[PDB]
């Protein structure tokens, strides 16, 4: 059944909770962000409303082909009606498109969904600022202190400084970028823009990205393979096999492959710096995996809540284990005890 941290109390409302089938009493579903794990179920048979972004709502009309008379897109920043309850959606700086929820409850309580999220010091200066957050429901992906990373900023320089390098030096270089899902599409945009190519990519993709308001997307990307030296292919095929094979497909234009899998943490965060990466080399092919996340690190999560103060902490991620819910715990009194909330 729908579990307990997706409902949000004294509303008929859900968040992230369309594979329950009816969920006895919501009379309004929010998607926070288009990533299948929160979407499952959506389908163009759905005919109850769904609140989300544009963007949110541009990919449940062309990708799911959810019909237009439940789509309830809903501008940034801006105080809106639902079914009689103040509501503002905020960037979340996850994925395009992706959200959080400030919700101000008839009794007065106020409730912050950040759905999924990067903390940043930029949400300390939002419409957050102005008033005082009761209940927090907090993506706790990372929420463990051996998660660091790098600042994407960082990642995608050392991105941008190898490739251009690479093919620079041998001309008949190809660059592969992987991906299975929106977000980090700065991984092949950037690198796409230093070599004066634009990316190419299957009709799926091509659709999917057509779908974000990506501005001058027009001039970035392309179906057309052959004319691009940035290509984007499934995550899956970012292995050794599945990249001779689609070195043969390209027909001897090209004699090299470098290919980046942008991945979340891995344990190597925990010893070396980005200036340290190293590829995985089999012959002519060169795989990197670069540490680009679009989840807080434990220290950005942390400042964010510290920042905010909230009365109780909800987690949304690594709910499932008593183990994990025990550590996480122990870490919200931690920090509220340093603080003094
Ligand atoms: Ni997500």
């Given at each position: 059944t729908c579990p307990f941290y997706k409902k949000i109390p004294g509303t008929g409302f859900t968040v992230?909770?369309?594979?329950?089938?009816v969920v006895e009493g919501c009379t309004a579903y929010f998607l926070t962000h288009f990533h299948s794990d929160h979407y499952?179920?959506?389908?163009?048979?759905f005919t109850f409303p769904v609140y989300c972004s544009e963007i949110t709502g541009n990919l449940l009309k062309n990708?799911?082909?959810?019909?237009?008379?439940?789509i309830h897109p809903l501008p940034l920043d801006t105080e809106c009606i639902v079914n009689g309850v103040k509501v503002v959606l905020l960037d979340?700086?996850?994925?395009?498109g992706a959200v959080m929820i400030l919700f101000y409850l008839p009794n007065g309580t106020v409730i912050l969904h950040t759905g999924d999220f990067r903390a940043?010091?930029?949400?300390?200066?939002?419409?957050?600022?102005?008033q005082k957050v009761h209940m927090l429901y907090l993506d706790?992906?990372?929420?463990?202190?051996?998660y660091t990373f790098p600042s994407q900023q960082e990642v995608i320089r050392f991105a941008i400084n190898t490739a251009f390098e690479a093919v620079t030096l041998n001309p008949h270089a190809l660059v592969v970028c992987g991906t299975?899902?929106?977000?980090?599409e700065k991984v092949f945009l950037a690198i796409a823009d230093v070599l004066g190519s634009k990316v190419g990519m299957s009709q799926e993709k091509y659709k999917t990205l057509q779908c974000?308001?990506?501005?001058?997307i027009n001039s970035l990307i392309t179906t057309d393979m052959c004319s691009s030296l940035v290509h984007l292919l499934?995550?899956?095929?970012?292995?050794f096999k599945g990249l001779q094979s689609h070195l043969k497909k390209?027909?001897?234009?090209?004699?090299q492959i470098l290919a980046f899998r942008p991945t979340?943490?891995?344990?190597s965060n925990k010893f070396t710096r980005i200036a340290d990466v190293i590829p995985q080399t089999k012959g002519n092919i060169s795989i990197y995996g670069i540490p680009y996340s679009e989840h807080s690190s434990y220290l950005e999560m942390k400042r964010f809540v510290q920042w905010l103060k909230p009365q109780k902490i909800i987690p949304?991620?690594?709910?499932?284990?008593w183990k994990s819910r025990s550590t996480m715990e122990k870490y919200f009194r931690e920090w509220k005890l340093e603080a003094g909330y």
């Amino acid at each position: 059944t729908c579990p307990f941290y997706k409902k949000i109390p004294g509303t008929g409302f859900t968040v992230d909770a369309f594979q329950y089938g009816v969920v006895e009493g919501c009379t309004a579903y929010f998607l926070t962000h288009f990533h299948s794990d929160h979407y499952a179920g959506l389908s163009k048979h759905f005919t109850f409303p769904v609140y989300c972004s544009e963007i949110t709502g541009n990919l449940l009309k062309n990708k799911l082909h959810v019909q237009e008379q439940y789509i309830h897109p809903l501008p940034l920043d801006t105080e809106c009606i639902v079914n009689g309850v103040k509501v503002v959606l905020l960037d979340a700086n996850h994925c395009p498109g992706a959200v959080m929820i400030l919700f101000y409850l008839p009794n007065g309580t106020v409730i912050l969904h950040t759905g999924d999220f990067r903390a940043d010091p930029s949400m300390e200066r939002s419409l957050l600022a102005d008033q005082k957050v009761h209940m927090l429901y907090l993506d706790t992906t990372y929420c463990s202190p051996e998660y660091t990373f790098p600042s994407q900023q960082e990642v995608i320089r050392f991105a941008i400084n190898t490739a251009f390098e690479a093919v620079t030096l041998n001309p008949h270089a190809l660059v592969v970028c992987g991906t299975y899902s929106i977000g980090k599409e700065k991984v092949f945009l950037a690198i796409a823009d230093v070599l004066g190519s634009k990316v190419g990519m299957s009709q799926e993709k091509y659709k999917t990205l057509q779908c974000l308001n990506i501005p001058e997307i027009n001039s970035l990307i392309t179906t057309d393979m052959c004319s691009s030296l940035v290509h984007l292919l499934p995550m899956m095929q970012i292995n050794f096999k599945g990249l001779q094979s689609h070195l043969k497909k390209c027909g001897g234009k090209y004699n090299q492959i470098l290919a980046f899998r942008p991945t979340g943490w891995t344990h190597s965060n925990k010893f070396t710096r980005i200036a340290d990466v190293i590829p995985q080399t089999k012959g002519n092919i060169s795989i990197y995996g670069i540490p680009y996340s679009e989840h807080s690190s434990y220290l950005e999560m942390k400042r964010f809540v510290q920042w905010l103060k909230p009365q109780k902490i909800i987690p949304t991620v690594n709910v499932g284990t008593w183990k994990s819910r025990s550590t996480m715990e122990k870490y919200f009194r931690e920090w509220k005890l340093e603080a003094g909330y």
